[PDB]
Design a binder for this molecule. Structure first.
Ligand SMILES: C=CC(=O)N(C1CC1)[C@@H](C(=O)NC1CCCC1)c1cc(F)cc(F)c1
Length: 451
């Protein structure tokens, strides 16, 4: 057995789990898998279950504050470019492209490019040591990071601030927490009204901040929902709002990861919103596409993808919410894809006409969402009304490229609107197309040739 070190405070919720503060020494049995592990605190003496993502071995590279694991290139830039981060804010991560190399990412400022991240490959020596340039080597990553925190010696900037992060969200409210009773949940601020319920900020067991969706009675069966949520429960992805739990007594409450800065449509309208440029819009659309790509890999269907059901967080993280919920609603109008409650303008016509909701109808929607993203939230088909959008779409019509949308993107929307589902692109493609939309020249990594 290995002592692990805590990387974040975790305020004990239930009986059976453990409170600990960042730094505590915890004892666990090596070969454990799963999301919740059994720990004995050699610090506190207390014992319980802990979320496995909140610890790392003692004295291993992972243990360090600045070590961000196998986070992605595109997402490290998200965290580093936070505008409160001084120059020299850094992190260390695993390289996505060179088998076992690590990579040091560092914020800098440049007259041409503004504030930008510079990525340095760190290769491991025959000695187990580490080097950014052959000229300057160490026996460990920690020595390396120490040294460049004192002089840039080649680096764009001396390392100053460990990259600031947030506590990850655990995977579940605690071990064995799926269905919970109303009284564990406290509704504090109500956040908005839907067509079939409300959305709330709240707290579970007086500790964890949660979102709480409350369903209007008669909307779905609590039976149908629960059997559905055995599926949703399994969809874990960093761009899907995580489904924590549920109260299966009418009225259904659905407990979800709190998203701090609200719906995407809201956020696009209104300030912090009126001034985003395309490369951040396109980075948002790529985040949604990575969420939907996982949905795609899991043979699932969202059924109401659009900006109103994307939530936004810190640093413009975007996440897909309320997936596969819309199927279970019983409102004989809505289910007919009729009425004031049905997003006809985002609905692929085969869904509108034949209930044929599939991952490809979700690709249609995604194309509409791209117009929402390039208009800062303007309604789609602006001159039309809903009652008329079906005929017009079945008769061949499509949206002209919004003013101020690069035609390369608009032609992507047009693949999303191709008449025959099976010739619309996949989400894998939509994801790769957008994480690579802007092509610079060679400086992928800084050449450590000699610095
Ligand atoms: C009528 C417009 C609307 O807001 N919808 C309707 C589907 C269009 C909301 C909705 O009512 N949400 C309420 C239930 C819990 C919180 C508030 C909705 C969005 C989805 F992504 C999936 C759903 F199943 C439902």
């Amino acid at each position: 057995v290995t002592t692990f070190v805590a990387l974040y405070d975790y305020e004990s919720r239930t009986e059976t789990d453990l409170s600990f503060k960042k730094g505590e020494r915890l004892q666990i049995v090596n070969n454990t898998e799963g999301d919740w592990w059994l720990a004995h605190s050699l610090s506190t003496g207390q014992t319980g279950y802990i979320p496995s993502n909140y610890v790392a071995p003692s004295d291993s590279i992972q243990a360090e504050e600045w070590y961000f694991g196998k986070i992605t290139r595109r997402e490290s830039e998200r965290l580093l470019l936070n505008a409160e981060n001084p120059r020299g804010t850094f992190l260390v991560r695993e390289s996505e492209t060179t088998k076992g190399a690590y990579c040091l990412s560092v914020s800098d400022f440049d007259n041409a490019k503004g504030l930008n991240v510079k990525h340095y490959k760190i290769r491991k020596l025959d000695s187990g040591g580490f080097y950014i340039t052959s000229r300057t080597q160490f026996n460990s990553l920690q020595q390396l990071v120490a040294y460049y925190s004192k002089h840039a010696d080649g680096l764009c900037h001396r390392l100053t601030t460990v990259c600031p992060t947030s506590k990850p969200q655990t995977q579940g409210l605690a071990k064995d927490a799926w269905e919970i009773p109303r009284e564990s949940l406290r509704l504090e601020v109500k956040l908005g009204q839907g067509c079939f319920g409300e959305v709330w900020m709240g707290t579970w067991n007086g500790t964890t901040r949660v979102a709480i969706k409350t369903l209007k009675p008669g909307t779905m069966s609590p039976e149908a929902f629960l059997q559905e949520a055995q599926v949703m429960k399994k969809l874990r992805h960093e761009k899907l709002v995580q489904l924590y739990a549920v109260v299966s007594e009418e009225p259904i409450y659905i407990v979800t990861e709190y998203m701090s800065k609200g719906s995407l449509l809201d956020f696009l309208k209104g300030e912090t919103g009126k001034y985003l440029r395309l490369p951040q819009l396109v980075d948002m659309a790529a985040q949604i596409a990575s969420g939907m790509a996982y949905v795609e890999r899991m043979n699932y269907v969202h059924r109401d993808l659009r900006a109103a059901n994307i939530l936004v967080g810190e640093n413009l993280v975007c996440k897909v919410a309320d997936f596969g919920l819309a199927r279970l609603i019983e409102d004989n109008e809505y289910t007919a894809r009729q009425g004031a409650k049905f997003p006809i303008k985002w609905t692929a016509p085969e869904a509108a006409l034949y209930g044929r909701f599939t991952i490809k109808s979700d690709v249609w929607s995604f194309g509409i969402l791209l117009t929402e993203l390039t208009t800062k939230g303007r309604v789609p088909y602006p001159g039309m009304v809903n009652r008329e959008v079906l005929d017009q779409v079945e008769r061949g019509y499509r949206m002209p490229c919004p003013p101020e949308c690069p035609e390369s993107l608009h032609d992507l929307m047009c693949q999303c609107w191709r008449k025959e589902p099976e010739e619309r692109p996949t989400f894998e493609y939509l994801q790769a197309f957008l994480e690579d939309y802007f092509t610079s020249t060679e400086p992928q990594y800084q050449p450590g040739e000699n610095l």
